Design a protein around this ligand. Structure first.
Ligand SMILES: [Mg+2]
Ligand SMILES: [Mg+2]
Lengths: 596, 596, 102
């Protein structure tokens, strides 16, 4: 009797203890976080999931290690196209070639709102579809109750935009995000801190935060850091640097090592001082520099313009391109290229699709940045763009009908060096890089350098190495050997274009094999030349990286990558890591700040 | 042309400025706050509305001046009845008269949860009905999105509850509040800081905060306070004290004035030090003391027991009650009284309805507070309750059949003084008052006193003054004059009970008029005697109040009262005023802390 | 008893100074300030936030703060500012700008 009732008493005592436990413990809940990448080629959503924890008398915070990308959405229109379309309608067609009174454009602010609305509705539909498809009903309840912070950040595409247009657009973009469709129940919200243009330096810093976070090099716990006898927290492992080559710009980011000698002209960033990371995180002094015109699309347009305006390459209407394969031929233009099933290359005539449009638009005498600044005019003229001429002739490669590939890798490297990496004057729209002390890529490793390991990122940068690895031209364990890379690329780039029944083919010189010719690999040799040039510049630095790695992705704890490389995770971390500020903005004010 | 387009430009510029304004300004939103009064006679909901404000980088807070009561709900069962019913079923009937092994009751914790559930569902239904009826659709959206903090606090009814029962009940009450019906969409939530028993001293302190808040005496802004040359914030007007007489206990609260001489045995509370008010509020040292058995219901039972066990009043089965009118007669019991249409008084026989049940239940040899403590046993025996006897004889007024009113006010005052205000031993269940240095009401003004103005509150306390004012026995501008009150009450209380066709009547001695005899005024003369006794004790103090006011309510800025007097507003303020803590618990953790 | 904070700031004279020289000099200047003569009893002290070169923009911003402070245009109290119905604090008087030619 007494033994059995003592157990019954213990069940009642347990029932109370289980409830005491519930009201004393921390409770975990799922939150969705949205990063809208307003890049040069497109505007795309990035839907993330994170675990939030609420503790009695401590508030709510995000576990930074729980941040995972659920999906990167569809590639919708870039903000540049939205604005230029608006100008076409309200300033009139060919505003690129005429003086425009910017003051008059203020009467068309509601119309800019209507144009922006169209894009915002597509992004909202895409975000909601991703959320509806990935979450279960219990997850949706949590995600819907917590609120969904939105961080729409613009990069190189509208970085060089003229007048007040872009900043007025941001005010409208935030208003649209703050008024989501009530039907879906997802409570999206933003503020001027989350949704804004980000500098190239910030863009680079955020990609550096992403890399070190995912690879477990960056952390604040005993596993990733150590506190010395003088109370200074050091990272347990070396923080790695990053080279990121996107569509319009390229970012070079590296932490500075102990006893680093910097000239007064070079401006390095302290992560804590510049409020990128909280005080509890290990300190670092980081060089972050971004170069406009160094992206895949923008350098392709600029390289063609410069190379085919050079008499060493332009003769009798034929521009001899050493960065293109033997047997490859295209119309002499910077228009978007399509490798057709018949082996022919079709150059798109649409001005909006021409890789020189952003540069030729910037380089105009009707842009106050050119008309008032000889400096900028001279940079434009140095790349064969006369800002005094209409848009059509600024984009035109004069007395040039056909571009023919010569497949000469060393000539390609030589030209990539003189045009892109080490030009006489800084490439246009680079006042930010110049202000931090760097006119060009060649100056980055001359003025500052580090033993910090380096990661090379970007779609083209990886395709360059992976292509050479696939044809067994490079070893699988390639660690950055310059001569090994140049020798491999010299062989691959001397390949002939053969037009076969199953479509065009890239034929390797010594029966080494072959691959299909397409719109993504036709000009890969320019990127290999960029890689070679970059590696030579890093190799010349006073301090060389401990190692160089090419990575598509970083594996998570379960062997599967939790998120992509890039600035997106970094921007999230930059806000969520400041616990108090995040609690106030994300939870205290929250989506309810928008209530009618 | 230029004048008209300049205006069109100004409309576009305005559109942007309006949006910049929205994303820079503070935004106001409506929140509902719920206070559940778990009192001695009942458990009732109190639904409040408040204006919250969210500012960029400042979080969210409540404007304390916006706190308004929307409705006080229905009187559902008190927590004492829930627990005693549970004991009746699981410890067996008449557990009040037998030894009970409390350890064995642990096996019935789920059953206590089921009993508590029944009451919680009624309170939730009542709260939701009030919210649905008072709010419009835009208000409901705000109220539903913000979350609804619930503060269920118990007072005198279960303050003296035996064993571990009450605290186990609170764990269950919180779990029930944290799991509301999902159907209504109102997100109710609590935690151990909001939902808990409150001491009599806290209860008094909260009623003091309510009074001074509503009357605009308490404040932190230049309108209600001033900062001196030494950085000390003083209230602009004197903070007033409060006497609150409820159903089971009476609270006496007053701030201490400059250079106040306190004996080491008297424990005064500092509002800031004891964390009742934040640092930004003016400081005050407050005497707060609560007396069990001084409430309307509890003193009525105790007074009858004591008076009718006295040979000066009990003779030949007739107890002569000087606190009852000439011609009034009732059965000799402390059972609930009903003045019937025929003029007869029906005494309820139900043990749960007897005004002595709480005291006779406390005063038991099977209660460890009596069996281990001679002190407590002696206090019980001093009020004619033998703790060794069964419940039925502890509640019984021995050799007494009929109570007859003598309408002798001075004899009534004399008895209220000896029984209630200045007893030989402290009235039972008063260890809290005794610990703060006060055994009885008479000791409060002897040991501590203040020039601070005083407010007299409670349903009966006000009816006492208002009755005498209505019959023109007291002037409309009555300011506390003892002799004026005693002279008025002596006249009113010498009234005869006449049984008329339209029902029973209270006939005033010198054709002064009349009023109906009912269940609420039959024993009002005891309360008038309590008032007289209290006023004499305050008048004897070293420092006397600047003024004494009887108030039913305090008028708001629009001439209409925003809330009632009592501890409810005070408990809200005690939590909402600590901005950071409130933001973390109410908004950061919020109702989402409960998400599955 | 309170200690004497020292703010040594350099302006246009060494703003255009080449190589690493100036920044190495600042590290030495701070060490010197942090080691005053014990004889006089005045406790001078600095840190890298107080003692450093200031940019032309900071120099201008600081002169703007000086002007508005002294002229009573800049303040957070009711005399120099007003909180609107939306909780935003505005300066009561227009903040003035500055042209400083050194
Ligand atoms: Mg990008
Ligand atoms: Mg009460």
């Amino acid at each position: 009797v007494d033994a059995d009732t003592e157990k019954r008493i213990n069940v009642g005592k347990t029932h109370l203890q289980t409830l005491r436990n519930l009201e004393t413990r921390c409770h975990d809940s799922l939150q969705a976080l949205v990063v809208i990448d307003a890049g040069s080629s497109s505007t795309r959503t990035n839907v993330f999931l994170a675990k939030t924890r609420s503790c009695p008398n401590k508030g709510r915070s995000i576990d930074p290690d729980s941040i995972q990308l659920i999906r990167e959405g569809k590639r919708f229109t870039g903000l540049r196209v939205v604005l230029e379309e608006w100008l076409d309608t309200y300033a009139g067609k060919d505003w690129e070639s005429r003086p425009v009174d910017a003051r008059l454009l203020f009467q068309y602010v509601p119309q800019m709102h209507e144009g922006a609305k169209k894009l915002m509705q597509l992004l909202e539909e895409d975000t909601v579809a991703i959320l509806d498809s990935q979450l279960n009903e219990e997850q949706k309840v949590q995600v819907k109750a917590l609120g969904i912070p939105v961080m729409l950040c613009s990069t190189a595409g509208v970085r060089d935009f003229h007048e007040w247009y872009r900043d007025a657009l941001f005010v409208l973009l935030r208003h649209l995000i703050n008024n989501p469709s009530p039907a879906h129940g997802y409570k999206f919200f933003t503020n001027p801190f989350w949704t804004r243009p980000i500098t190239g330096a910030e863009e680079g810093l955020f990609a550096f935060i992403t890399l070190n976070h995912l690879s477990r090099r960056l952390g604040e716990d005993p596993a990733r850091s150590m506190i010395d006898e003088y109370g200074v927290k050091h990272s347990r492992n070396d923080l790695a640097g990053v080279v990121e080559v996107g569509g319009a710009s390229a970012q070079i980011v590296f932490p500075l090592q102990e006893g680093t000698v910097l000239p007064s002209s070079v401006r390095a960033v302290n992560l804590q001082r510049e409020r990128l990371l909280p005080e509890r995180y290990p300190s670092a002094d980081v060089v972050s520099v971004s170069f406009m015109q160094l992206g895949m699309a923008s350098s392709a347009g600029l390289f063609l313009k410069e190379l085919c305006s050079n008499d060493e390459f332009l003769q009798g209407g034929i521009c001899s391109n050493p960065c293109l394969f033997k047997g490859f031929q295209q119309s002499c233009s910077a228009g978007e290229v399509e490798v057709r099933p018949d082996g022919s290359a079709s150059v798109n005539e649409d001005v909006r699709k021409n890789r020189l449009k952003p540069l030729a638009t910037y380089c105009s005498v009707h842009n106050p940045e050119i008309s008032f600044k000889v400096t900028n005019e001279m940079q434009c003229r140095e790349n064969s763009i006369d800002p005094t001429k209409p848009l059509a002739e600024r984009m035109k490669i004069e007395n040039c009908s056909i571009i023919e590939g010569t497949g000469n890798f060393d000539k390609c490297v030589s030209q990539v060096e003189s045009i892109l990496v080490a030009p006489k004057l800084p490439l246009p729209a680079n006042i930010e890089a110049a202000s931090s002390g760097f006119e060009s890529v060649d100056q980055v490793f001359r003025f500052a350098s580090s033993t910090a390991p380096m990661f090379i990122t970007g779609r083209g940068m990886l395709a360059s190495i992976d292509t050479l690895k696939d044809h067994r031209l490079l070893r699988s364990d390639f660690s950055g050997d310059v001569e090994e890379l140049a020798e491999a690329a010299r062989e691959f780039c001397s390949s002939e274009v053969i037009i076969r029944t199953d479509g065009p083919v890239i034929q390797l010189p010594n029966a080494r094999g072959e691959q299909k010719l397409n719109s993504l690999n036709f000009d890969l040799c320019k990127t290999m030349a960029l890689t070679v040039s970059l590696l030579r510049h890093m190799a010349a630095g006073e301090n060389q990286p401990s190692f160089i790695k090419w990575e598509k992705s970083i594996a998570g704890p379960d062997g599967k990558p939790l998120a992509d490389l890039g600035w997106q995770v970094g921007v999230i971390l930059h806000h969520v890591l400041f616990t108090e500020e995040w609690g106030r903005t994300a939870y205290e004010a929250g989506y309810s700040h928008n209530l009618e």
